[PDB]
Design an enzyme around this catalytic site. Structure first.
Site, PDB file in Angstrom:
ATOM      1  N   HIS A  41       0.822  -1.159   0.108  1.00 40.43           N
ATOM      2  CA  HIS A  41      -0.050   0.091  -0.106  1.00 40.43           C
ATOM      3  C   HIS A  41       0.800   1.413   0.013  1.00 40.43           C
ATOM      4  CE1 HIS A  41       0.251   1.312   4.360  1.00 40.43           C
ATOM      5  NE2 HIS A  41       0.111  -0.191   4.473  1.00 40.43           N
ATOM      6  N   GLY A 143       2.685   6.123  10.024  1.00 41.83           N
ATOM      7  CA  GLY A 143       4.165   5.975   9.912  1.00 41.83           C
ATOM      8  C   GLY A 143       4.740   4.555  10.321  1.00 41.83           C
ATOM      9  N   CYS A 145       3.678   1.562   9.479  1.00 43.36           N
ATOM     10  CA  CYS A 145       3.475   0.462   8.631  1.00 43.36           C
ATOM     11  C   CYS A 145       4.803   0.075   8.119  1.00 43.36           C
ATOM     12  CB  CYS A 145       2.476   0.662   7.491  1.00 43.36           C
ATOM     13  SG  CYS A 145       1.211   1.463   7.959  1.00 43.36           S
TER      14      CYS A 145
HETATM   15  C1  LIG Z   1      -2.912   5.247  10.934  1.00 40.76           C
HETATM   16  C2  LIG Z   1      -2.298   3.806  11.501  1.00 40.76           C
HETATM   17  C3  LIG Z   1      -1.892   3.811  12.911  1.00 40.76           C
HETATM   18  C4  LIG Z   1      -1.284   2.565  13.352  1.00 40.76           C
HETATM   19  N1  LIG Z   1      -1.007   1.562  12.337  1.00 40.76           N
HETATM   20  C5  LIG Z   1      -1.035   1.738  10.904  1.00 40.76           C
HETATM   21  C6  LIG Z   1      -1.863   3.197  10.568  1.00 40.76           C
HETATM   22  N2  LIG Z   1      -2.117   3.146   8.967  1.00 40.76           N
HETATM   23  C7  LIG Z   1      -3.364   2.538   8.589  1.00 40.76           C
HETATM   24  O1  LIG Z   1      -4.030   1.925   9.197  1.00 40.76           O
HETATM   25  C8  LIG Z   1      -3.514   2.980   7.329  1.00 40.76           C
HETATM   26  C9  LIG Z   1      -4.399   1.830   6.486  1.00 40.76           C
HETATM   27  C10 LIG Z   1      -3.770   1.020   5.821  1.00 40.76           C
HETATM   28  C11 LIG Z   1      -4.777  -0.128   5.208  1.00 40.76           C
HETATM   29 CL1  LIG Z   1      -3.818  -1.221   4.251  1.00 40.76          CL
HETATM   30  C12 LIG Z   1      -6.023  -0.041   5.272  1.00 40.76           C
HETATM   31  C13 LIG Z   1      -6.360   0.795   6.049  1.00 40.76           C
HETATM   32  O2  LIG Z   1      -7.674   1.066   6.360  1.00 40.76           O
HETATM   33  C14 LIG Z   1      -8.502  -0.279   6.824  1.00 40.76           C
HETATM   34  C15 LIG Z   1      -8.057  -0.317   8.375  1.00 40.76           C
HETATM   35  C16 LIG Z   1      -9.690  -0.667   8.392  1.00 40.76           C
HETATM   36  O3  LIG Z   1     -10.247  -1.272   9.141  1.00 40.76           O
HETATM   37  N3  LIG Z   1      -9.804  -0.279   7.015  1.00 40.76           N
HETATM   38  C17 LIG Z   1      -5.660   2.004   6.621  1.00 40.76           C
END
Ligand SMILES: Cc1ccncc1NC(=O)Cc1cc(Cl)cc(O[C@H]2CC(=O)N2)c1
Ligand SMILES: Cc1ccncc1NC(=O)Cc1cc(Cl)cc(O[C@H]2CC(=O)N2)c1
Ligand SMILES: [Cl-]
Lengths: 305, 300
Positions: A41, A143, A145
């Site tokens: 992603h 950040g 990921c």
């Molecule tokens: C902001 C953050 C905080 C901690 N770890 C990671 C992040 N970043 C993310 O989650 C960004 C992200 C990437 C992907 Cl591949 C999918 C996504 O939306 C999905 C999550 C859900 O339930 N719908 C969101």
């Protein structure tokens, strides 16, 4: 004496962390040999995340579209390919700090250390478990990921997790290093929820053995139970079923403390039906399930890496 | 989102761990530049441990009585001196892996990461707090002496603890890297006991702010309290007094969440009175006191 949630020493993994940038998105990569692994992603814009066609997004990228930074040195990207949900960036330099490693896919209940990173720089290390619902209760911000989970088995780092996203409940989802998600999750900004979680029974028993080893015996009792009666009670309290493999794995701890596994199961059954009655076990008022039997043996015997 | 007990990445400290042997005793040493630091009790025999005269024991040792092993390489000891309860072995090679470092003496309530080691090899990393009674609740076995505690804010490692001993309650005592013990402890096997421990109030408040930042508010209430009334209540539960310094330190977290420090103190008073009633705060059924206000800001 003492029992702590202990992570593996992170040094071997720290020497592999790099920063990967594609356009406006910056995340972490894992540099092993001449390949940098990161979540696919990284190639998406916010709108692409709504419904991405990764093969189509990737075909539009050139090598120079990926900026890889290892410390204050820019690595040259000479190739790129996707394996499941992981992007593999071929670089012109093999990582001189590449440890002896392997990629392993773990099972729910297995624990691992996470080296949380931001901008290719390690920020912290913590120990966690792959929940039965395939999420991890991690601690991650935007950040993070590309941060990875790992274990050390002798002098070999077994990489088992790469961070991809946070679900609405605040828990986290990711893949193995071959890009296969743990759990029924997809790498898309869309409505996703973790299934109802359960407690890792074999790990609670391991931690009860650790408590006995550390002098906490108040919860022991004269009783035993059959595996089937214990599993009926475990099902009632949203505990994972205990198999004969789990009992076999608890054999050494059972022999060291003199508490048969089914004898410890009778302590656990009483704890579930009655609570702790104001008491604690290893400084906890809840039953801890993020230490495996191997973690308990390792910590109580001082195994080094 | 999420809140974990998080240790600093240990790589910078792992590259400093060495094994130090003097006679039959083997423990860990910290190799920085051309000096290896280790507990001075490495020079003691079983017969020396109740009332050792370290100056007398040390004068009898020559450089070649100390065997220092870094990985599978033996370092040559070219000098030795004692500074308080730490032995400093000058070696013929500067550690090429020496990070940017400093020695800092911490105060009770301060947290740090411990890299537990045996025979100069790291076994694991965990997070600790210096208890108000100057002990640490670590996880250490025989052979762990010389394992160190540290913080790595930025890329500078601040070494704050070196492990020396375990007290009869299972808690641990040690020194700063200048060899000064934390607490009223001595490096002798004479009967020693930690003073009654108390809860680190400022850290519990920091963790309640972390819970609010992570979306939890069930424990908040419509009340406030004076600082003195809070301390009168908190002391009844063996909590450390909250000083105006602590109230000032919580200022940024108070401004970020919109909950005044004395308003959060009233939540804490209520939690001490009622318990959690089947609820958890950040996955815990007890009030956590091993996160400082600085840790909360760094992690959240
Ligand atoms: C902001 C953050 C905080 C901690 N770890 C990671 C992040 N970043 C993310 O989650 C960004 C992200 C990437 C992907 Cl591949 C999918 C996504 O939306 C999905 C999550 C859900 O339930 N719908 C969101
Ligand atoms: C066995 C162990 C376990 C964990 N960490 C460390 C150790 N080792 C020790 O405690 C060895 C030791 C060294 C010193 Cl300098 C003093 C001492 O006795 C003091 C403690 C007390 O109450 N009297 C004991
Ligand atoms: Cl319970």
């Amino acid at each position: 004496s003492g029992f702590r949630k202990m992570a593996f020493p992170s040094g071997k993994v720290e020497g592999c962390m790099v920063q990967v940038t594609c356009g406006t998105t910056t995340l972490n990569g894992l540099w092993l040999d001449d390949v940098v692994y990161c979540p696919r992603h990284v190639i998406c814009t916010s709108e692409d995340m709504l419904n991405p066609n990764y093969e189509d997004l990737l075909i539009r990228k050139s090598n120079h579209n990926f900026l890889v930074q290892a410390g204050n040195v820019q690595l040259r990207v000479i190739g790129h390919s996707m394996q499941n949900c992981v992007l593999k960036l071929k670089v012109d330099t093999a990582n001189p700090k590449t440890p002896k490693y392997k990629f392993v896919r773990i099972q729910p209940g297995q624990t691992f250390s996470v080296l949380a990173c931001y901008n290719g720089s390690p920020s912290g290390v913590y120990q966690c478990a792959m929940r039965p619902n395939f999420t991890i209760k991690g601690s991650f911000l935007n950040g993070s990921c590309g941060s990875v989970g790992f274990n050390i088995d002798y002098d070999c780092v077994s990489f088992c997790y790469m961070h991809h996203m946070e679900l609405p409940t605040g828990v986290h989802a990711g893949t193995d290093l071959e890009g296969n998600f743990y759990g029924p999750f997809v790498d898309r900004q869309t409505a996703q929820a973790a299934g109802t979680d359960t407690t890792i029974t074999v790990n609670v028993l391991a931690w009860l053995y650790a408590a006995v080893i550390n002098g906490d015996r108040w919860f022991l009792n004269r009783f035993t139970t059959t595996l089937n009666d214990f599993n009926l009670v475990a099902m009632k309290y949203n505990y994972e079923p205990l198999t004969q493999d789990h009992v076999d794995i608890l054999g050494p701890l059972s022999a060291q403390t003199g508490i048969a596994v089914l004898d410890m199961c009778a302590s656990l059954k009483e704890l579930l039906q009655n609570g702790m009655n104001g008491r604690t076990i290893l400084g906890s008022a809840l039953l801890e399930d993020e230490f495996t039997p191997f973690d308990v043996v390792r910590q109580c015997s001082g195994v080094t890496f």
